[PDB]
Amino acid sequence: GEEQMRLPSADVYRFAEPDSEENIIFEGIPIIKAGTVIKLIERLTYHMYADPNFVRTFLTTYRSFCKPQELLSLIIERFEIPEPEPTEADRIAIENGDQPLSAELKRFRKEYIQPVQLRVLNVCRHWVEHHFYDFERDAYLLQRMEEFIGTVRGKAMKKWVESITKIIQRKKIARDTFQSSPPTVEWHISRPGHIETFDLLTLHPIEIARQLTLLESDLYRAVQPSELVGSVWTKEDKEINSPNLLKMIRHTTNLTLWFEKCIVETENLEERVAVVSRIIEILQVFQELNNFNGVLEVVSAMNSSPVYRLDHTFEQIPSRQKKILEEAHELSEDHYKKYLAKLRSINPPCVPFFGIYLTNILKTEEGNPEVLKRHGKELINFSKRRKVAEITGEIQQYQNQPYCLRVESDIKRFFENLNPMGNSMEKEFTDYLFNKSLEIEPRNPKPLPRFPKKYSYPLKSPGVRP
Numbered sequence: 001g002e003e004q005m006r007l008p009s010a011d012v013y014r015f016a017e018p019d020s021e022e023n024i025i026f027e028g029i030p031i032i033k034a035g036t037v038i039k040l041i042e043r044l045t046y047h048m049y050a051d052p053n054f055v056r057t058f059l060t061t062y063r064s065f066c067k068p069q070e071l072l073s074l075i076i077e078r079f080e081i082p083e084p085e086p087t088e089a090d091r092i093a094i095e096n097g098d099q100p101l102s103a104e105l106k107r108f109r110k111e112y113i114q115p116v117q118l119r120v121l122n123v124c125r126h127w128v129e130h131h132f133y134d135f136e137r138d139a140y141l142l143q144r145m146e147e148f149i150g151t152v153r154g155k156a157m158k159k160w161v162e163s164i165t166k167i168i169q170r171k172k173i174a175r176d177t178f179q180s181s182p183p184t185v186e187w188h189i190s191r192p193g194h195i196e197t198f199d200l201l202t203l204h205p206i207e208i209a210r211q212l213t214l215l216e217s218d219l220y221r222a223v224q225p226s227e228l229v230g231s232v233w234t235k236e237d238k239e240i241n242s243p244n245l246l247k248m249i250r251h252t253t254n255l256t257l258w259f260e261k262c263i264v265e266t267e268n269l270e271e272r273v274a275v276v277s278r279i280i281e282i283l284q285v286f287q288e289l290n291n292f293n294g295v296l297e298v299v300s301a302m303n304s305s306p307v308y309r310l311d312h313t314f315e316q317i318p319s320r321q322k323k324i325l326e327e328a329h330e331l332s333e334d335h336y337k338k339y340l341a342k343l344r345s346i347n348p349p350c351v352p353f354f355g356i357y358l359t360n361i362l363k364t365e366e367g368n369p370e371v372l373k374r375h376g377k378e379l380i381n382f383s384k385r386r387k388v389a390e391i392t393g394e395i396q397q398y399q400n401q402p403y404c405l406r407v408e409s410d411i412k413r414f415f416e417n418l419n420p421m422g423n424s425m426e427k428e429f430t431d432y433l434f435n436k437s438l439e440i441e442p443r444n445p446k447p448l449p450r451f452p453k454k455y456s457y458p459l460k461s462p463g464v465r466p
């Protein structure tokens with residue numbers, strides 16, 4: 001029909017081939033279920049309408065099916081639309097030195113070229129505003145973007161070119177508050193500045209929880225949604241594609257293993273009871289601060305193979321502290337049912353539990369195919385990417401919740417530099433922790449031996465009331 005005849009031919013332009021069962025599948029604006037990358041690019045910059053939901057989802061998840069350099073080449077290719085030849089009558093007009101009517105050329109420029117080109121510029125703008133890290137990780141990509149943007153000509157394009165340049169410059173500059181005063185910083189045995197004495201029992205439990213909550217809040221807020229797409233944190237380029245997520249994972253591993261280390265390396269039973277009791281008090285302050293990430297880190301340490309088996313230690317833990325620990329565990333049961341109910345009911349600020357998102361994204365990545373087949377052709381399963389983007393969107397709704405708590409730089413550095421494993425690998429260190437657990441509390445027939453004290457300071461906690 002004339003609709004396809006008005007569009008450019010497939011021999012000079014790839015984004016005008018008609019829709020079909022073997023290049024695009026759908027789930028007012030239709031929702032894309034699957035398609036070839038060309039059809040995804042076409043609909044990302046569609047001439048009939050804007051689609052901000054799709055633009056946001058595509059730019060969050062495209063690195064799982066298209067490289068940044070390839071996306072830029074494709075949207076530049078999309079932008080470069082050939083114009084139709086003059087009609088026979090207008091050819092005669094041009095050869096006679098007269099102005100052609102150019103009715104179809106003008107209609108095509110207004111109803112197709114200008115909308116598609118403005119839609120490409122809108123993708124460029126969203127890309128530099130929300131995903132500038134692609135340009136920080138690849139200077140050549142930015143050079144190509146600035147060259148493309150800098151050569152765009154048009155009255156209607158001018159405003160778009162300036163906003164894109166403004167955002168890029170604002171991002172380069174960034175690379176190079178509270179209504180009330182925060183509470184008084186709490187000290188226990190260790191004095192301010194005496195970093196050498198800082199430890200689990202010498203720092204105030206309230207302040208350990210406050211400083212770990214600020215540390216974890218900052219780590220949570222730094223994770224970008226694309227660090228979780230396509231399971232890139234479990235792949236080779238994880239250090240470049242997921243630096244903030246890996247920093248959050250490594251913190252959780254170091255903090256959890258440090259709590260286990262403090263517990264099993266305290267051989268004296270009475271002292272180990274004081275250590276465990278202090279870690280439950282730290283969990284109590286994490287609850288008060290709505291740091292669910294911190295609460296579930298303590299749960300993980302208490303449920304670990306070396307700690308969970310310490311029946312002689314938990315026997316001496318007051319019933320009230322055991323019930324607090326049991327209810328924190330129940331946050332994880334029934335697929336984190338109670339945890340999600342608590343998160344949706346609390347008032348900000350909070351630090352959500354990050355692990356649940358990683359688990360659910362891995363389940364979505366492993367349980368859904370990368371491509372869908374239709375008539376022998378492979379289409380990118382975009383609904384899979386949309387589901388991952390919806391989960392990462394849940395992460396983002398809590399990333400603008402700063403805490404009215406004063407940073408204590410020395411305590412902050414103490415927790416940033418925690419290295420319980422030392423030179424050991426994780427598996428070998430956890431085997432050491434379990435073998436250490438068998439040493440301090442041997443299995444049933446072997447009796448419980450007595451061990452000497454290691455702390456030359458009082459074990460009584462100052463409590464959790466500020």
Ligand SMILES: COc1cc2nc(C)nc(N[C@H](C)c3cccc(N)c3)c2cc1OC
Pocket residue numbers: 299302303304307308314322325326327328329330
């Ligand atoms: C079926 O498996 C489990 C059920 C649990 N049920 C409850 C209610 N709490 C648990 N753990 C909490 C955090 C806790 C309380 C007291 C002492 C210690 N050490 C840990 C559980 C751990 C389990 O497995 C590891």
